């Protein structure tokens, strides 16, 4: 009977834009609202508590109105940086009120602005296994979307950005591998979304 | 202050039962648990409203629980089955006014198999830098790949020389799966560690790339021909190289 929803299912918005989480509920009367933060395998952290009789509630960056009429309540993120990027919980205490029901949550990905795009794959050298060819599509900006191609024996990983701070150097980097024979390296992002003037160096 | 769940990770033969703990020392008379699925949230299994008090939730079916004294809320698992692979967590109230929050658990990572024989500890590989990588960045990225394990429990860290590093370090948040379309497919996870090309020019600098594996206990039996992956640690090195 009680339903919460929480839209968007999947959020991707660039590094300094603010951006609004949406949560509603059926019914009214006495309940709060309480937003979570997990990171992926790892636990629930409580980042905002709303009760009924209020309608703001902040903390650092985070803001969390409440319309109680209308049953929506809204999860404000000012000046969202790559570190922003998890899964967030909306869930509102049932009636009795001895239990918390929750929605869907939200995965937000907060995509970290490349200052100097220069998107190139390198093929690296083999460790504990004979073939086995490793290799990395790397330094390519936050609008480039990777797939995971289609073959037997090759794997792409999802994207990933890493942050030197010795250096104040941020990257996006992907990987893949495979055992076949016919599959250089470098073959599994050709058939994914890559830019022209992609580095593709032969080893 | 906190609620503790264990254990963190659990494989289980399906048939098998098995106790999930769960504990808090904040005096909190309402304790509740959930368990998280793809797609699904936090559904509510069971709650307790305090000391010899216990109610359904959404999804009773296949657990029960117990509250024989505040503190503790031990979940049971009756017969594991696959339906119930899923990651559970445990969460805390004080009481019954909305102007207390609840406070949740780690979480208890959990998988159901047929046979332990699914069950697989990782094979970890470092990968050198690309001389072009060098040439055209002057950056050196070294990739760690652990791949064939089953389940998905394993935590992986880099150590550059003595220390754990996390500078220029970033880890896929899922391993995929090796085999897409099935349940007990074994599982591939990659990371990526990225240094100056003058740190990985030195030759004594030492990279070291190891997976927690927590698999089974020393106390089920194996009747495989391989050796039981039982919980530990496979690591793959690299020196840096002028």
């Known amino acids: 009977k009680q339903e919460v929803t929480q839209i968007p299912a999947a959020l991707s918005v660039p590094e300094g834009e603010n951006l609004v989480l949406n949560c509603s509920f059926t019914?009214?009367?006495?309940?709060?609202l309480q937003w979570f933060r997990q990171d992926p395998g790892k636990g629930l952290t409580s980042l905002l508590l709303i009760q009924s009789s209020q309608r703001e509630q902040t903390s650092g960056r985070l803001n969390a109105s409440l319309d109680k009429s209308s049953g929506r309540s809204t999860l404000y993120i000012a000046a969202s940086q790559p570190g922003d990027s998890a899964t967030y919980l909306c869930?509102?205490?049932?009636?009795?009120?001895?239990?918390?029901?929750f929605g869907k949550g939200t995965t937000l990905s907060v995509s970290s602005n490349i200052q100097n795009p220069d998107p190139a794959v390198y093929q690296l050298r083999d460790s504990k296994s004979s073939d086995k060819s490793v290799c990395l599509f790397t330094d390519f900006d936050s609008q480039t979307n990777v797939s995971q191609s289609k073959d037997s024996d090759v794997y792409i990983t999802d994207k990933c950005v890493l942050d030197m701070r010795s250096m104040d150097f941020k990257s996006n980097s992907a990987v893949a591998w495979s055992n076949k024979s016919d599959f250089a390296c470098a073959n599994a992002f050709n058939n994914s979304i890559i830019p022209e003037d992609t580095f593709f160096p032969s080893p | 202050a906190g609620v503790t769940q264990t254990p963190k990770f659990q494989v289980l033969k399906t048939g098998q039962s098995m106790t999930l703990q769960c504990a808090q020392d904040?005096?909190?008379?309402?304790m509740s648990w959930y368990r998280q699925d793809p797609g699904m949230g936090l559904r509510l299994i069971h709650y307790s409203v305090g000391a010899g008090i216990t109610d359904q939730g959404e999804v009773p079916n296949g657990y029960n629980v117990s509250r024989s004294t505040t503190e503790d809320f031990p979940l049971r698992l009756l017969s594991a089955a696959p339906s119930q692979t899923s990651v559970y967590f445990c969460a805390s109230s004080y009481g019954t006014g909305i102007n207390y929050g609840y406070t949740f658990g780690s979480g208890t990572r959990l998988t159901v198999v047929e046979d332990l024989n699914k069950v697989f500890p990782p094979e970890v590989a470092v990968f050198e830098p690309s001389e072009a990588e060098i040439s055209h960045t002057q950056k050196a990225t070294l990739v760690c790949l652990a791949t064939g394990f089953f389940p998905d429990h394993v935590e992986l860290s880099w150590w550059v020389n003595g220390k754990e590093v996390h500078s220029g370090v970033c880890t896929d948040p899922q391993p995929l799966k090796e085999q897409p379309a099935l349940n007990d497919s074994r599982y591939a996870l990659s990371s990526r560690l990225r240094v100056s090309a003058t740190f990985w020019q030195n030759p004594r600098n030492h990279f070291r790339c190891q997976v927690q594996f927590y698999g089974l206990s020393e106390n089920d039996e194996w009747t495989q021909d391989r050796a039981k992956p039982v919980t530990q640690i496979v690591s793959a090195e690299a020196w840096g190289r002028a």
């Open positions: 019914d009214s009367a006495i309940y709060n």
């Open positions: 904040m005096n909190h008379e309402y």
């Open positions: 869930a509102q205490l049932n009636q009795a009120g001895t239990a918390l029901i």
